[PDB]
Amino acid sequence: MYQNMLVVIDPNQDDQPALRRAVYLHQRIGGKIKAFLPIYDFSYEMTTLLSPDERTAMRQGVISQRTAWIHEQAKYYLNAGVPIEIKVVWHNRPFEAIIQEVISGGHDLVLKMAHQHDRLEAVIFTPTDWHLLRKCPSPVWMVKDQPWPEGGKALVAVNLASEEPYHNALNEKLVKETIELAEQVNHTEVHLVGAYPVTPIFDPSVYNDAIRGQHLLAMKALRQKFGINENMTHVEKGLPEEVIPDLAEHLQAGIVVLGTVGFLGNTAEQVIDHLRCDLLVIKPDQYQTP
Amino acid sequence: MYQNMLVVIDPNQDDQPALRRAVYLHQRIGGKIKAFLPIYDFSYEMTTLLSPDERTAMRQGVISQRTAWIHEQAKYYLNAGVPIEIKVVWHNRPFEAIIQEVISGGHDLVLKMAHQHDRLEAVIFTPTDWHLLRKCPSPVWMVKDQPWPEGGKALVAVNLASEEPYHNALNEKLVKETIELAEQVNHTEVHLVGAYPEFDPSVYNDAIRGQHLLAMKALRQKFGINENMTHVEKGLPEEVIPDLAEHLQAGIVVLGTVGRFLGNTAEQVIDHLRCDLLVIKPDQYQTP
Ligand SMILES: CCCCCCCCCCCC(=O)CC(=O)O
Ligand SMILES: CCCCCCCCCCCC(=O)CC(=O)O
């Protein structure tokens, strides 16, 4: 139950909110913590300049000092007694190194930091962030560099819509892995959100209350196995890429759980891009990464 | 020579800065314009139950609705006589649909819109923007939704540092395709930037920088540019290029990338910039 965390280190700043969040989690749930950082310098392939002696001496010469850096930035935690393993890998293509360390390693979680400049604008993602969000097999927890709202709320977005049988397991996993988590922190404020589209321009009006006929019910099929009753479940219409973020904001939600199976969701990509809170994509298992 | 433009329509707002820029270009360079927009609706995803017929009907009604919508936003350009071609394709994964239309129609340039709130802040890119920036065989012009700097300035970033001759071919492609274009549009000023990063480092630094001044002076005088507009700095390009670009009054920056997708080396350069972007594939570059 989330007890082997992989923390992605940002080499461009000193504060690592991913690490801090990992520690906060460790204080409530426990597990391992691995400060990971793929590093690289352009100096290593200019072969016309440095023979292998100089270039590899410098290759290890970066790794050592940046490992020292991560130590100097995890020092208070280490001295306080937090079991943090530090590992700096020499790698081009960062996201690749991260995913490989996830698979070889044995990880429950990946915690990376995302930026937010202004209070009510969306969080800023990098290509690396996106690669992880669609290729990383482990549940990815994107942690924004902004403090958690004092009213803690977890939000679960469900693909209620499609009657397909692989979206059902993912739903129940999303909820279950959220309930086993919220209980263990806590707060334990778990909301359930569905989003369905009403088709606007044979009578169209039947399709509408049919779409909603399934949605209200399917949403509630989750709930009575999972005991989340009506008060914090939401079924609204409009576009998911707008329905769930503003909802998350009016709700004062600090995190949202997302599910993707397989670009991987332009339906969900647009959802992510206009988000202003923490993100937890749980790719369901039973999936293999390229 | 960019005379068959593909304009990506943002379906979440009404103003299309990509279209506006495309027209602006059309007035000085000429060519065609194709207003493109990939769309998809969840109803088509509902296998049950809409009988295949009405599902195609609602498909047709969404396509029709967006054709009317895009028509209604370019009419001031259309009635005035701008050859704007509208084509709405039905696709769930937009970047795929865009690249397919690029290769199928053979387009010279793709103009898409990126947001920027604030000055001295970075530009915001979408997943679609990133797929296009690394898989689109044609030059991609990301146009921010902010007015062009009143002092027009163009900047070209080259991988001078690493010696291999296809990065050289790509370099001069960048250069030629930037000046021959600025020349025909607004006579803007095209700058060129390099970035550079027994035991003894002190020799290594001045060996690399000795190299950069080499290659920069090798490039510049084939293109008849002045040393007054060549710049070579040390530090990381992902930090070097934006500070210069803002200090230089740059409105756009031309980038050179080869697939084997785009390295993190330049990806970081892209995420941190605050002006228009023009990514150029070496050609031919083959999209999967
Ligand atoms: C589905 C997620 C349910 C658990 C949410 C985790 C709560 C995190 C609280 C963060 C508190 C902080 O602001 C960190 C700190 O003070 O160092
Ligand atoms: C490499 C590209 C260099 C060519 C310069 C392009 C100039 C475009 C300036 C846009 C002028 C406007 O401000 C008109 C508008 O509102 O779109």
Residue numbers in the entry:
A (entry chain A): 3 to 203, 212 to 272, 280 to 307
B (entry chain B): 3 to 199, 211 to 273, 280 to 307
Question: What does the original paper state about this entry?
Answer:
The universal stress proteins (USP) family member UspE is a tandem-type USP that consists of two Usp domains. The UspE expression levels of the Escherichia coli (E. coli) become elevated in response to oxidative stress and DNA damaging agents, including exposure to mitomycin C, cadmium, and hydrogen peroxide. UspA, UspC, and UspD belong to class I; UspF and UspG belong to class II; two Usp domains of UspE belong to class II and IV based on the sequence and structural analysis. USPs might be associated with several functions, such as cadmium binding, ATPase activity, and an intermediate in lipid A biosynthesis.
Specifically, it presents the three-dimensional X-ray crystal structure of the recombinantly produced UspE from E. coli at 3.2 Å resolution. UspE exists as a monomer, and the structure reveals a compact and 2-fold symmetric dimer in the crystal. The crystal structure shows that UspE is folded into a fan-shaped structure similar to that of the tandem-type Usp protein USP from P. mirabilis. UspE is composed of ten β-stranded mixed β-sheet and nine α-helices. More importantly, we found an unambiguous stick-like electron density in the hydrophobic pocket of E. coli UspE throughout the refinement process. In addition, the stick-like electron densities were very similar to a 3-hydroxymyristoyl group of Uridine-5′-diphosphate-3-O-(R-3-hydroxymyristoyl)-N-acetyl-D-glucosamine. The characteristic hydrophobic environment in the pocket indicates that UspE can bind unidentified ligand with a 3-hydroxymyristoyl group in the cavity. This pocket was surrounded by hydrophobic residues in β6, β9, β10, and α6. However, the ATP binding motif of UspE was disordered in the crystal, due to the intrinsic flexibility of these regions. Our structural analysis indicates that E. coli has two putative binding sites (Site I: His117, His 119; Site II: His193, His244).
